[PDB]
Amino acid sequence: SYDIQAWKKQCEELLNLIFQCEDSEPFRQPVDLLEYPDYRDIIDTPMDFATVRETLEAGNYESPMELCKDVRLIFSNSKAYTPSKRSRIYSMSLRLSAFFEEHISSVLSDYKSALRFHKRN
């Protein structure tokens, strides 16, 4: 109850579910800057799900809000890159975002409740 640390394993489980999703395929590893030579002209801060997982495992997120900001960057980097809707990878981005948001909602609410309970007195 009001466990301040519970978010970390809940985010590891949610990343496992995202790796199972066929829709994560394009987002599982950093973009090859040699394959996509212009990528860093458009994208200031590359992000992918393996980087998010390793940052979590390094103990380099202090809160699930920080992890949520990096996952949302994957989705906005994909939108910044799409030429049009006529792309399988843009279709996969929007479905995976909806799945992520549906599952992260309770992780954020529970964490923020726990900080409130810790400060209650």
Ligand SMILES: C[C@@H]1CN(C(=O)c2ccco2)CCN1C(=O)NCC1CC1
């Ligand atoms: C650069 C794009 C979009 N993309 C990303 O934004 C991304 C984030 C993390 C890893 O990749 C996935 C790769 N992309 C492709 O077009 N590959 C498909 C090839 C036929 C062309």
